[PDB]
């Protein structure tokens, strides 16, 4: 081969990557505890200002899920409050007499909040359904109350 | 390419011509004095047009500053003035007919 072959050295990465068919490199990152990853999005996207022209980026993983939406939940708590308000406006069958029991809607979050702190656990879907259990049982019991007075 | 025994070599083309290749050369479009690039964004099967059409307006609004000089966008064919404004128009006359 040396009758005709020169040779030399250089670089080259074995594992190249392209994301959505576009030249990419894998950028993992975990945040320090106590700071949401959307704060890291605001941080690195304002550090994505420190990028040349013709450069883009992506947030995926569960950051793809939150990249779609972190929480459309408060829209559903909103229209949940709506549908609770009107359905109780049928069960009461009364104008704004239901609004009383709306006051005891937040009275189930209490030991959820504080007991979640005193044991030291944060929000997730189990926490969300914990909210659902509290409001359902609690507000249910209050409907037994206003039904008995009713 | 071929040589002689001395090494009287033949490089490329030397007989020929290198350029970029139109994979055909057969279509001459023209839009008002010159050709252009019309881009057929066809209907998908299950496509959901309106907000998509505004997002294609927004896609123009993604790509617009990255151009060569003189490069000019146009909606030379579009359906969405006829249909977006067919429903702005028809739904408009509809709702004001409900006013009547």
């Amino acid at each position: 081969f040396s009758a005709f072959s020169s040779s030399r050295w250089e670089y080259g990465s074995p594992r190249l990557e392209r994301y959505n068919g576009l030249p990419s490199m894998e950028i993992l990152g975990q945040a320090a505890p106590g700071k949401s990853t959307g704060e890291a999005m605001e941080l690195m996207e304002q550090l994505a200002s420190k990028l040349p022209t013709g450069v883009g980026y992506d947030w995926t993983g569960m950051s793809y899920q939150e990249r779609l939406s972190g929480n459309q939940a408060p829209s559903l708590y909103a229209i949940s409050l709506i549908v609770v308000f009107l359905c109780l406006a049928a069960l009461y069958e009364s104008w704004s007499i239901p609004f009383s029991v709306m006051l005891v809607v937040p009275l189930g979050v209490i030991g959820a909040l504080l007991a979640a702190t005193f044991r030291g656990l944060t929000n997730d879907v189990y926490f969300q359904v914990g909210l659902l259990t509290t409001i359902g049982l609690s507000a249910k019991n209050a409907i037994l109350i206003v039904e008995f007075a009713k | 390419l071929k040589v002689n025994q001395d090494g009287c070599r033949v490089l490329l083309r030397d007989v020929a011509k290198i350029e970029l290749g139109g994979e055909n050369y057969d279509i001459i479009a023209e839009f008002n004095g010159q050709p252009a690039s019309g881009l057929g964004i066809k209907l998908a099967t299950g496509a959901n047009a309106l907000d998509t059409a505004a997002a294609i307006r927004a896609e123009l609004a993604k790509m617009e500053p990255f151009f060569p000089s003189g490069l000019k966008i146009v909606y030379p064919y579009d359906t969405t003035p006829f249909v977006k404004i067919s429903i702005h128009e028809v739904v408009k006359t509809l709702v004001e007919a409900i006013i009547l």
Binding site: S2, A3, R8, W9, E10, Y11 | -
Partner: protein, 327 residues
């Protein structure tokens, strides 16, 4: 202590072509097939009787030429005894003297006949020109050959000396010219030994004696030819095997040989190795990394023994971090 092994091009010491030197019927083979034939072994017999009868007849005619030349010379001597008065003629004096010149010309011509019949008479019996191993015979007994015909008889070699024409690439000769810029493993500078590696895997029981400074260059590929007469008392090695060989290890012992681990082709088209600094915060130095050698790498540039090169921890550490040494 490094050199380079390569396949060689072994080529026998002697090459000799045996051919017919005279015409005539091959009488008998006076030798054997595949035998050791020294110089002067009388190859095939052809009848010398024409040359011998012409030879002895030629010296007999020489005897008659000096006989009548001797008698006529003695009559010239009579005329020397009789040149005093007018008894002989001067024309008869120098007449018999010129006749003696003619007869002595026949004497010298007869000497050319005895000489030529002696030369061809020596050509009647063939001899081996040089020594060594012959192959097998081509001419049987009773055969008829001719002088100067295009066919040859045989070919001998010699195998206790044996050449090895070294086949070499072109560029590494330049690196051997870098050995000419070095000259340090090259000892005695015309010839020194080179270890054989022959086809059985075993080496030859003695290494060969390598010639260094031949200049025989190919005119198509640059495949260099370097003849090297080697010892072989067993005569078993043949011209064309083709065995390997390598020079005696080695050249200058100072040679920066770092293992492959810290060796970094860094950056593009370049190669540095990172050393620690003296204040433990590390300190890369670009170095000319030469050819890899073994599990290691030759470096020419800069570095010495005792330089605090690393192995392990290079990834948590960038330039500027102190370091506590370990081996």
């Amino acid at each position: 202590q490094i050199t380079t092994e390569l396949p060689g091009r072994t080529s026998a010491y002697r090459i000799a072509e045996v051919r017919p030197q005279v015409s005539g019927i091959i009488l008998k083979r006076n030798f054997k097939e595949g035998s050791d034939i020294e110089a002067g072994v009388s190859l095939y017999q052809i009848d010398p009787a024409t040359y011998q009868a012409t030879y002895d007849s030629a010296k007999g005619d020489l005897a008659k030429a000096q006989a009548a030349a001797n008698i006529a010379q003695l009559t010239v001597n009579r005329y020397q005894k009789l040149l005093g008065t007018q008894y002989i003629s001067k024309q008869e004096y120098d007449q018999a003297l010129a006749d003696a010149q003619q007869a002595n010309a026949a004497v010298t011509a007869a000497k050319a006949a005895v000489e030529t019949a002696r030369i061809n008479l020596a050509y009647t019996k063939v001899t081996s020109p040089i020594s060594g191993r012959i192959g097998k015979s081509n001419v049987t007994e009773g055969a008829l050959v001719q002088n100067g015909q295009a066919t040859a008889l045989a070919t001998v070699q010699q195998l206790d000396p044996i050449y090895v024409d070294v086949t070499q690439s072109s560029n590494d000769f330049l690196r051997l010219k870098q050995e000419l810029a070095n000259g340090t493993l090259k000892q005695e500078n015309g010839k020194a030994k080179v270890s054989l590696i022959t086809s059985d895997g075993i080496k030859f029981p003695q290494d060969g004696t390598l010639e260094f400074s031949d200049v025989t260059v190919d005119q198509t590929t640059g495949c260099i030819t370097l003849r090297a007469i080697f010892p072989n008392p067993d005569h078993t090695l043949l011209p064309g095997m083709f065995v390997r060989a390598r020079l005696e290890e080695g050249l200058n012992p100072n040679a920066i040989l770092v293992p492959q681990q810290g060796v970094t082709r860094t950056p593009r088209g370049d190669a540095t190795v990172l050393v620690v600094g003296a204040d433990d915060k590390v300190e890369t130095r670009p170095i000319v990394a030469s050819q890899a050698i073994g599990d290691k790498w030759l470096v020419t540039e800069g570095l010495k023994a005792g330089d605090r090169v690393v192995i392990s921890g290079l990834q948590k550490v960038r330039p500027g971090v102190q370091v506590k040494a370990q081996e």
